[PDB]
Design a protein around this ligand. Sequence first.
Ligand code: H72
Ligand code: H72
Lengths: 292, 292
Amino acid sequence: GPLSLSVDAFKILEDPKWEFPRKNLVLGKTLGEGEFGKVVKATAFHLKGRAGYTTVAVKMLKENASPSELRDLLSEFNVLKQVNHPHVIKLYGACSQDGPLLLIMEYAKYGSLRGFLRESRKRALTMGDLISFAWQISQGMQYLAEMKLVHRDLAARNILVAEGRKMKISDFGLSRDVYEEDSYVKRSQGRIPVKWMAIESLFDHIYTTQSDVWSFGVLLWEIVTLGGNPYPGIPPERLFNLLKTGHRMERPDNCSEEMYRLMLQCWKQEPDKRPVFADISKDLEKMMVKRR
Amino acid sequence: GPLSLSVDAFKILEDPKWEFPRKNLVLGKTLGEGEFGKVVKATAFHLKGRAGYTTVAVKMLKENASPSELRDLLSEFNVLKQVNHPHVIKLYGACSQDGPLLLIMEYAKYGSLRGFLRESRKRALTMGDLISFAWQISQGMQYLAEMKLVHRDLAARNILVAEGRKMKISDFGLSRDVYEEDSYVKRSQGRIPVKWMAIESLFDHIYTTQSDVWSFGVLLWEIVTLGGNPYPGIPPERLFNLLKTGHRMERPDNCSEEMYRLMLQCWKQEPDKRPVFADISKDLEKMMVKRR
Ligand SMILES: NC(=O)c1ccc(-c2cnn3ccc(NCc4cccnc4)nc23)cc1
Ligand SMILES: NC(=O)c1ccc(-c2cnn3ccc(NCc4cccnc4)nc23)cc1
C-alpha cells in the first residue's frame, strides 16, 4: 500500500545529506511522548560539519507503533528536509539503517510553549513578551503558507522555546502539501484535537492555510491566558453545536480589545473573512509598537 | 460530516435502556490511558435494577480528544450495545447529557492479560491455565465472527482478566461491522500496532475475521511467553520486508510443537489457509485434554 512504498523507497534512499552514523548518536532522557511520537534528548558527534558533540532532540516511534505513526514520522522527515526558517524547528539528519528510524532535530532548551507559559506569570512575562511570541509564530506560519504547507496541528504544545526565547513551530507529523489544490481533505476522521480545529475542518474535513489561521487564534488565546485550556469545562462533542450556533471563547482576563478582535477574526465562520498570516503579523507588530 | 451526524443522532437518542443518571455515578482512580482512551474505576448506584452500588469501569475521552477518538468512543458504544457473550466485556450504560460522554463497563479485577501474565511465572500459571485463557478468547472471537464483527485490535493489552480469571475481550474502538462485504477496508493508515497486523492488513488495508485470526496468533505467542514483546528488538518498519520474505517469530521457550504449529497456521500468507476460530478452539480443547 502507500506506506510499504514509502518505507521501501526511504530504506534504499542513498541520501548522504541526511543520513547520520548511528554510532555517532547517543540517546538520553525522554523529553516527551504523545501523538508526535517519542522525543529523547541526545548528543551527536560531528553533526553537519560541527567538530565535537552537539546537543540535539531525537524523534522516534513509540512502543507498538501503528502504520499511522510510521506514516507521520516519514511524512515529517520529508517535510522538514525542504523547510528552513528561524521560527521552524530544524531537521539535522536521520538514522535509517541497522536500527529503528531516528530523526535528529534542533534542541529547544525551554521545551513546549504551553509548559513555558504555565511555568510563568503576568518567570515574569509582559504583554510585549507574549505579542513577540505570537509574532514569531505568525512569521514561521507565513513562510509555511508561502511554501504551500498546512501544519493542521498549531497549538502551544506544538511550539518549542529555544535559547533567547525564540519560538520554533514543531510536530510536522500531520502537516500536508497543498500546492495542487490549496486545500487538504481526508475522508477519515483527523487526529487534531477538536478544540483547535476550524469549523470547516471539524464538519467538512477541509484543511487550508485559513484553518491554520483558526488554530493560530486558539494558540493566541493559549498565549494570552499563559497556557489556558480552550473552551474550559466544555466537552469536545459540544464543539459541533457550540461553533455552528455562532459561539466563540469569551474575552479572557488581561486581554486588550484589539488582541481579542484578532482572536475573533481568526474564528470567522467564512475562511475568506479570516486574516492571512502576513495580516496577523502586521496586527501584532502594531500592538507591540503602541506598547504592550 | 460523518461524526457531526453521529454526535447529534446520539445526543437526541432517547434510549432509557442505556442512559444512566450522572448523579448516580462516582469516578475514582485512573485504571489506564492509551489509544482506547481514558478508563477510570467507578461505582454506580442502582445500575441495571441492582440495589446499591456496583463497582464498574468508566471509559471517557482523554484530554484534547480528536474526532478520531470521539468517533471510536461512539463506535464502541454502538457495537457493545448489540454484543452479549461471557468472554466479551459488557456495556452497562452511558451518561451523554450535561457532561462529557461516559461509557459504563463491566469491571475486571485483574486488569489487562498482558499485565496479569507479566506479573506471573511458569502467581504460578500452568500450560493448562494458558491454553484455557487462549480457548476462552477463541470462544468470544467465534461469537464476534458469527455476529460479523472484525475486532482488528486483538492483543494481550486488549484482553481483561475478571473474577475467576475469566478472559473478557476489550477495546472495541477499532472494531467494524462486515455483514455486507465480509471485509473492512480503509484508504487511510490504521491505528493497530504493526506487530499484530496480518500481512494483507499491513500491505493492502484489508481487515477480515481471518486478519483477526492472524492477531490471535500473535496473542497466542504473547500468552505462551507470559506477555513477551512480539518480534523483539526488530523495528516495526522492518515487518513489511520480514513478513513478505516469509519470516515469522521463532518457536519460543516452553512451547509445544502442536502449540507453535497453531501459531504458524494463524500466520499463513493466504487468509483462507488460516484456521477459523471454531477450529482454533477445537485445537486448544485437544491440547487441554491431552494434559498441559
Ligand atoms: N519535530 C518535532 O516534532 C520535534 C519535537 C520536539 C523537539 C525538541 C527539541 N528540543 N526539545 C525539548 C523538549 C521537548 N519536549 C517534548 C515536546 C515539546 C513540544 C513538542 N513536542 C515535544 N522537545 C524538544 C524537536 C522536534
Ligand atoms: N471497553 C473497553 O475498552 C474497556 C476497557 C477497560 C475496562 C476495564 C474494566 N475493568 N478494568 C480494570 C482495569 C483496566 N485497566 C486499563 C485497561 C486494561 C486493558 C484494556 N484497556 C484498559 N481496565 C478495566 C472495561 C472496558
